[PDB]
Amino acid sequence: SFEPEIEALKSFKNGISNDPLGVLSDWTIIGSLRHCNWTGITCDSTGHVVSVSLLEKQLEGVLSPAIANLTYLQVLDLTSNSFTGKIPAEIGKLTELQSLVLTENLLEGDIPAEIGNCSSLVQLELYDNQLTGKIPAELGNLVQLQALRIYKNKLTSSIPSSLFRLTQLTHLGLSENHLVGPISEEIGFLESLEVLTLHSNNFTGEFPQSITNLRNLTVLTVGFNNISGELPADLGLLTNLRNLSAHDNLLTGPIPSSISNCTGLKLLDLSHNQMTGEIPRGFGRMNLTFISIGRNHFTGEIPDDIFNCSNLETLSVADNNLTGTLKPLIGKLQKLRILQVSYNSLTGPIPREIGNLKDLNILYLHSNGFTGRIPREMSNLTLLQGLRMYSNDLEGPIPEEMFDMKLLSVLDLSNNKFSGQIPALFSKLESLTYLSLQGNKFNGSIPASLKSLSLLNTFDISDNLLTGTIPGELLASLKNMQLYLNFSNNLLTGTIPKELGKLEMVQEIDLSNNLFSGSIPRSLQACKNVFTLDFSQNNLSGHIPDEVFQGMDMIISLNLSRNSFSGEIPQSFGNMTHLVSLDLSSNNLTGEIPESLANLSTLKHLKLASNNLKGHVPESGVFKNINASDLMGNTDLCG
Ligand SMILES: *[C@@H]1O[C@H](CO)[C@@H](O)[C@H](O)[C@H]1NC(C)=O
Ligand SMILES: *[C@@H]1O[C@H](CO)[C@@H](O)[C@H](O)[C@H]1NC(C)=O
Ligand SMILES: *[C@@H]1O[C@H](CO)[C@@H](O)[C@H](O)[C@H]1NC(C)=O
Ligand SMILES: *[C@@H]1O[C@H](CO)[C@@H](O)[C@H](O)[C@H]1NC(C)=O
Ligand SMILES: *[C@@H]1O[C@H](CO)[C@@H](O)[C@H](O)[C@H]1NC(C)=O
Ligand SMILES: [Zn+2]
Ligand SMILES: [Zn+2]
Ligand SMILES: [Zn+2]
Ligand SMILES: [Zn+2]
């Protein structure tokens, strides 16, 4: 407890460039021989320095090598600071280190091999840094190690075998790195392991089948790796697993039946894999919370017992080959927040019991075979924000009560057999951002009441039996629509309202395949945000407003084909930089062809076809690799 230690900690105060909280200030005022009473510094019963605890003190600077002088040092804490530079190789001399820390900093360089000399090191904490280079095999000498937490770094190469000798390991975290190489079966040797996080790396090879050895394991995460192979049987050995996360891997073979024993499992993420086989039983005895087995090749019905674990909050079985019906048993699990049974081959009606879910937030069951009606009980899902039911065999009238869900935000009912007219009660949902009713048998004209929902960003009403005209006040209520507008493939008549000009910020506009008659309003010169415009398959007539496309510029695709468009081709098409595909086939265009469409680099597809054009056909540009069918037939063209 003499001079050299004080010299060492004073040497440590130096190098620490900036100290905004004034922590080391306290080490100056007190005194020299009173260092044991300094902020953070605590000594033993003999006066020697054993602990340096400076956490969240916002210290910046570099870690000083003089900390190799403090021989009696057992714990070095620097949690959540700004210590840049690297780790000193002399820090292996400390032989009294018990637990060494340096979490949440800016420590670059690679981890020194000299850390293998810390014979008393029980806890090594180096995560959330810039630590590069390979994992040092010398770390396999620290035979007292329990917690090895070096995740969230830039560490590379493969896992040294030595790490599997450290038999006292309970926590192990190598996640969030650039580690490669397989996961050796030698993990079976850390029998005292309790936490294994390997997720977010570049691990390959077969899956470590001897993971069934460590029966104290409670956390197992290996998400986002190229780990292939089958999940082991007798998985029901480890009756202490609570989190099991192997998603986004190349896992094959079925979900082991022995997983029925694991009674402590709460989290199972086996998604984005090639897993096969039917789904087992036993899930009714597990008290889980998140079951995510989507994006797999799972066959067979959805197991009834899965409906007994009334604390299940997330159920995700989508993108599978799952048959069967969504039984009414779903009425039991009332803690359920998000359900994705989409992209499957489920049959049967929607059960009324679904009105018992209460706190349900996301309801996704599209791309299946759900027949029947939408129950009125689904007005009880007040917390619901997302509803998807497209690509199904759902039919009949939309229940009135289901417009009493103020909180609902997104609705996709497209591609079904809903008949009848569009209810004005759709106004009751003044909080929709997405509305797709496309692909149906919706008849009658468009309700103007829909001017209520001013928060829309995607309005898809295409492919229907929609007659009448487009209400101007409805188009006008959508001022700041951000994305998509599709009225195409209907029986809409009349003219294109001037209120379409108020629709700025909108990217895709499609009014094709209708009975529109009037010429193209100049009103819509305001929408520069438009990427794709489609007014094809209509009875439109007139000249093409140069002045309306002069201020469109951001057009990616323009389809004005099969119309009664007369006039010349606007020169404004040359100033169109982002132009890619232009279609003006089947018109009464009597122009001479602009020389500006020639020298267009971004341009690629150009359809003129059945017109009445004259003059010399251009050369340089997209006329080099042009087809003759695109020109045939313009009556007369020299070139
Ligand atoms: C396994 O964990 C239990 C409970 O924490 C503990 O009593 C036991 O020591 C551990 N077994 C081994 C081999 O480490
Ligand atoms: C383990 O699961 C629980 C929820 O079941 C969760 O709070 C926790 O983050 C998970 N642990 C990890 C990060 O593996
Ligand atoms: C079942 O799991 C939930 C969440 O982990 C918890 O609230 C509940 O207490 C658990 N039941 C048991 C057996 O402790
Ligand atoms: C608009 O909706 C129709 C409905 O059939 C669809 O087929 C079409 O591709 C959509 N338009 C565009 C270009 O996004
Ligand atoms: C433009 O739309 C018309 C009529 O709807 C269609 O026949 C044609 O394929 C479309 N043009 C192109 C090539 O996008
Ligand atoms: Zn993690
Ligand atoms: Zn994960
Ligand atoms: Zn989906
Ligand atoms: Zn004019």
DSSP-derived 3-state class of residue 11: helix
Q: Any idea what DSSP says for residue 328?
A: G
Rounded Cα distance between 462 and 443, Å, is 12
The answer to whether the CB of 513 is under 6 A from ligand 5 is yes
Specify the 3-state DSSP secondary structure of 141: helix
Whose CA is closest to 554, among 522, 524, 532, 583? Answer: 532
Q: Which atom of ligand 2 lies at the shortest distance from residue 245's CA?
A: 14
Cα 482–Cα 485–Cα 487 angle in degrees, nearest 5: 170
Q: What is the dihedral of CA 274, 276, 279, 281, to 10 degrees?
A: -110
Q: Which residue has the tokens 């930089």?
A: 577
CA–CA gap between residue 26 and residue 434 (Å, rounded): 59
Q: From ligand 9's centre to the CA of 545, what distance in Å?
A: 7
* Contact 263 CB / ligand 3 (< 6 Å): no
Rounded to 5°, the CA angle 155-244-196 comes to 35
Q: Are 162 and 139 a contacting pair, CB within 8 Å?
A: yes
Using alpha carbons, list the distances in angstroms from residue 241 to 195, 251, 392, 534, 580: 10, 19, 38, 56, 55
d(CA 512, CA 533): 9
Q: Distance (Å, rounded) from C-alpha 121 to C-alpha 128?
A: 20
For residues 569 and 588, what is the distance between their CA atoms, to the nearest angstrom?
11
Other Cβ atoms within 10 Å of 413 Cβ, number: 23
Residue 82 makes CB contacts below 8 A (sequence gap 6+) with 58, 59, 60, 61, 105, 106
- Backbone angle region of 279, left / alpha / beta, with phi > 0 → left and psi within -120 to 50 → alpha: beta
Question: CB neighbours (10 Å) of residue 638?
Answer: 7
Q: Is residue 602 within 8 Å of 588, Cβ to Cβ?
A: no
287 CA → ligand 3 middle, Å: 6
Pocket of ligand 2 (CB under 6 A): 219, 221, 243, 266-267, 289
Give the separation between CA 459 and CA 445, rounded to whole angstroms.
16
- The residues with which 99 forms a beta bridge, in sequence order, are 75, 123
What is the side-by-side strand order in the sheet with 564-567?
A: 541-542, 564-567, 588-589
480: closest CA among 459, 496, 457, 514? 457
Instruction: Give the number of other Cβ atoms within 10 Å of residue 407's Cβ.
Output: 12
CB 488 less than 6 A from any atom of ligand 4: yes
Among 440, 464, 466, 489, say which to mutate for ligand 4: greatest number of ligand atoms within 8 Å of CB: 489
- Tokens representing 429? 């949902």
Helix or strand or coil: residue 113? Answer: helix
Instruction: Supply the Cα-derived Rg of the chain in whole angstroms.
Output: 34
What is the CA(199)–ligand 6 centre distance, in A? 7
191 Cβ inside 6 Å of ligand 1: yes
Indicate which ligand has the atom closest to the C-alpha of 198. 6
Token pair recorded at residue 452: 């209520």
| Distance in angstroms (rounded) separating the CA atoms of residues 504 and 159 | 55
310 contacts 286 by C-beta, under 8 angstroms: no
Residue 617's identity, in one-letter code, is: V
Residue type, 115: I
Q: Where are the beta strands (DSSP E) in 455-591?
A: 458-460, 465-467, 484-486, 508-510, 532-534, 541-542, 557-559, 564-567, 581-583, 588-589
Distance between Cα 513 and ligand 5 center (Å): 10
192 lines ligand 1 (CB under 6 A): yes
Q: Which pair of tokens denotes residue 59?
A: 């210290």
Tokens 């407003």 belong to 545
Contact indicator for 410, 436 with CB cutoff of 8 Å: no
**DSSP state letter for 442:** E
With the most atoms of ligand 1 within 8 angstroms of its CB, the residue from 195, 216, 218, 238 to mutate is 216
Nearest Cα to 133, choosing from 157, 151, 168, 160? Answer: 157
Experimental method: X-ray
- The C-alpha angle with vertex 322 and arms to 316 and 324, in degrees rounded to 5, equals 110
DSSP state of 132: B
User: Structure tokens of 197?
Assistant: 């996080």
Residues with Cβ within 8 Å of residue 513, at least 6 apart in sequence:
488, 489, 490, 536, 537, 538
Spatial CB neighbours of 541, under 8 Å, sequence gap ≥ 6 = 517, 518, 519, 563, 564, 565, 566
Distance CA 395, CA 220 (A): 45
Closest C-alpha to 421, from 388, 478, 464:
464
For residues 207 and 209, what is the distance between their CA atoms, to the nearest angstrom? Answer: 6
- How many C-beta atoms surround the C-beta of residue 575 within 10 A? 12
Cα–Cα separations (whole angstroms), residue 62 to 95, 109, 131, 513: 22, 12, 14, 69
**The dihedral of CA 544, 548, 551, 557: what is its sign?**
negative
Closest Cα to residue 508, out of 475, 459, 450, 456?
459
Establish whether residue 462 lines the binding site of ligand 4, counting it when its CB lies within 6 angstroms of any ligand atom: yes
Query: Distance from the CA of 197 to the center of ligand 6, in angstroms?
Result: 6
Closest residue by CA, ligand 2 atom 12: 243
Cα(289) to centroid(ligand 3), Å:
9
Give the H or E element holding residue 20. Answer: none
Q: Look at residue 103 and give its three-state secondary structure.
A: coil
User: Is 536 buried (19+), middle (13-18) or exposed (0-12) by CB count in 10 A?
Assistant: buried
Tell me the sheet residues that pair with 589: 567
Q: Which atom of ligand 4 is nearest to the CA of 557?
A: 13
Pocket test residue of 243, 247, 266, 292 for ligand 2, highest count of atoms within 8 A of CB: 243
Respond yes or no on whether the N-terminal peptide bond of residue 621 is cis (omega within 30° of 0).
Answer: no
**Residue 32: Cβ within 10 Å count:** 10
559 within ligand 5 shell (Cβ under 6 A): yes
DSSP H or E segment with residue 55? none
Compute the distance between CA of residue 124 and CA of residue 71 in angstroms, rounded to an integer: 18
SS3 of residue 158 by DSSP: strand
Which amino acid is located at 388 in the chain?
A: R
Longest dimension (CA), the chain: 107
CB 165 within 8 A of CB 188: no
Counting ligand 3 atoms within 8 A of each CB, the residue from 240, 262, 287 with the most, and so the one to mutate, is 287
CB 534 near ligand 4, within 6 Å: yes
Contact between residue 246 and residue 273 where contact means Cβ atoms under 8 Å apart: yes
Write out the DSSP string of 612-627.
---SBPP-TTTTTT--
Amino acid at 27: W
**Would the CB of 577 count as within 6 Å of ligand 1?**
no
Tokens 């409805």, located at residue = 474
Q: Which of 279, 237, 244, 283 is nearest to 260 (CA)?
A: 283
449 CB-contact burial (10 Å; exposed 0-12 / middle 13-18 / buried 19+): middle
Nearest atom of ligand 5 to the alpha carbon of 607:
13
Calpha distance 240→219 (Å, rounded): 9
**622 alpha carbon – ligand 3 mean position (Å):** 67
Q: For residues 111-143, b (16+ Cβ closer than 10 Å) or e, as one string?
A: bbbbbbbbeebbbbbbbbbebbbbbbebbbbbe
Instruction: Output the six-digit token pair for 629.
Output: 């069918």
Give resolution in angstroms: 4.0
Residue 27 belongs to what H/E stretch? helix 26-29
Domains of the chain, residue spans: 1-639
How far from the centroid of its chain's Cα atoms is residue 451's Cα? 32
Cα–ligand 5 centroid distance for 216 (angstroms): 64
